[PDB]
Amino acid sequence: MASRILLNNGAKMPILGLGTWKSPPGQVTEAVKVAIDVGYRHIDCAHVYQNENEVGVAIQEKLREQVVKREELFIVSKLWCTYHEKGLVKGACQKTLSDLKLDYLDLYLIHWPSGFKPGKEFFPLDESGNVVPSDTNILDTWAAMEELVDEGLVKAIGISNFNHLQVEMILNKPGLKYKPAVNQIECHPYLTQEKLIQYCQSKGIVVTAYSPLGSPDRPWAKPEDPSLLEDPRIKAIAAKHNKTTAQVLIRFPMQRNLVVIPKSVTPERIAENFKVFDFELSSQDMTTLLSYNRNWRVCALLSCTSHKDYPF
Ligand SMILES: NC(=O)c1ccc[n+]([C@@H]2O[C@H](COP(=O)([O-])OP(=O)(O)OC[C@H]3O[C@@H](n4cnc5c(N)ncnc54)[C@H](OP(=O)(O)O)[C@@H]3O)[C@@H](O)[C@H]2O)c1
Ligand SMILES: O=C(O)COc1cc(Cl)ccc1C(=O)NCc1ccc(Br)cc1F
Ligand SMILES: [Br-]
């Protein structure tokens, strides 16, 4: 399989990247070093993950060692919800750059459509537990993102967790200067996203699938929840191909023309997860995996559901 996908900014993006949410700060430097050593060239980051400094140590060491050139890496981060304000976006991007110890990002995303009240807290709450919004809107935040391209801080801009109507709002923005390059959304066999993916792809927006393994380490996991990695139907497809279930789960979005960003801090799994370019799922396998959709979401959050721009 070709390793990169062409974006609508003219740059190429590796279809496989390393996720870093929940990667402990004392483990993520080694995780990223191992990832780069075994072939990863795309790292998915975010300020809210609280580990960008440690990710950056790894990137910098591998650049210093000349394992890779900067041009060969594709580093992604995301603007957190408490920084949607005009006067805060550049500094948020710059903090991420300094933590990652980069002078540009390959891709910078609006992490969620919703803006929250600025301050120290990532989820500012009222006394009844509702998130405190910002009266910022997605269009003005987008204009701020466009500024970052024009200042040389980022090569591409995009969105994350935007629903169909919100993507459309951006595409219809008066005076739109740069289209979003990417919409990064949850996607796996239990949340197959056919409608949003077709919409975005039809508009030339590349979709990145997050939580492709079903985020078994998500902090809110409950006993009852479905488990992709343990689903005997998916294990059977893996066995047929002499691959792991995780490998099937990673190859699946690749064959849908998606980018995919599985997270691991386990060196053996980091390497396993990369060994997905030498086998093919059949069309029948693909349709079978699609058939498992149950509209089940890892990522949703009750405290934010009354925000005007909550996407789900
Ligand atoms: N834009 C957004 O709003 C958003 C939201 C969610 C996620 N993301 C991004 O997407 C990335 C991936 O999603 P995720 O972290 O939610 O979950 P995920 O990648 O679906 O699953 C990660 C979990 O799977 C385990 N795992 C990894 N490889 C495995 C393998 N080969 N066999 C068995 N278990 C394996 C990991 O364990 P170990 O680490 O212990 O090996 C970890 O517990 C995130 O890290 C983040 O970068 C973005
Ligand atoms: O958002 C992510 O990337 C992964 O999930 C989280 C990560 C961290 Cl470090 C903290 C919290 C989350 C988390 O709770 N994410 C879910 C979330 C967030 C905001 C909104 Br508007 C809706 C929503 F569903
Ligand atoms: Br939101």
Side-chain angles (χ1 to χ4, degrees), residues 189-194 196-201:
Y190 300 156
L191 186 73
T192 50
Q193 299 271 29
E194 291 85 328
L196 182 55
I197 290 169
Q198 174 62 24
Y199 179 75
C200 289
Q201 294 183 155

Side-chain angles (χ1 to χ4, degrees), residues 132-180:
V132 182
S134 168
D135 65 16
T136 62
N137 64 60
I138 60 177
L139 300 184
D140 288 339
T141 305
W142 190 253
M145 298 289 284
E146 292 175 327
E147 293 197 3
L148 301 177
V149 174
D150 288 330
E151 295 170 312
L153 281 69
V154 307
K155 298 296 192 208
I157 49 174
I159 59 188
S160 184
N161 304 292
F162 279 44
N163 69 33
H164 160 55
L165 287 183
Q166 292 171 328
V167 178
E168 184 173 59
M169 194 189 336
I170 300 279
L171 294 176
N172 290 345
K173 178 186 181 303
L176 183 67
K177 193 175 185 180
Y178 305 114
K179 293 176 204 167

Side-chain angles (χ1 to χ4, degrees), residues 21-22 44 46-50 78 80-81 111-116 122-123 131 160-161 184 210-211 219-220 297-305 307 309-312:
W21 174 38
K22 311 169 265 59
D44 184 76
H47 177 67
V48 77
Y49 300 163
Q50 300 184 49
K78 319 187 191 78
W80 185 249
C81 301
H111 200 150
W112 290 85
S114 301
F116 304 163
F122 292 153
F123 285 90
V131 76
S160 184
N161 304 292
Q184 178 181 130
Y210 80 57
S211 306
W220 54 77
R297 282 179 199 276
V298 166
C299 265
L301 189 63
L302 190 62
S303 65
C304 293
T305 56
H307 189 293
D309 298 314
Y310 184 82
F312 311 136

Side-chain angles (χ1 to χ4, degrees), residues 34 255 287:
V34 166
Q255 290 188 207
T287 295

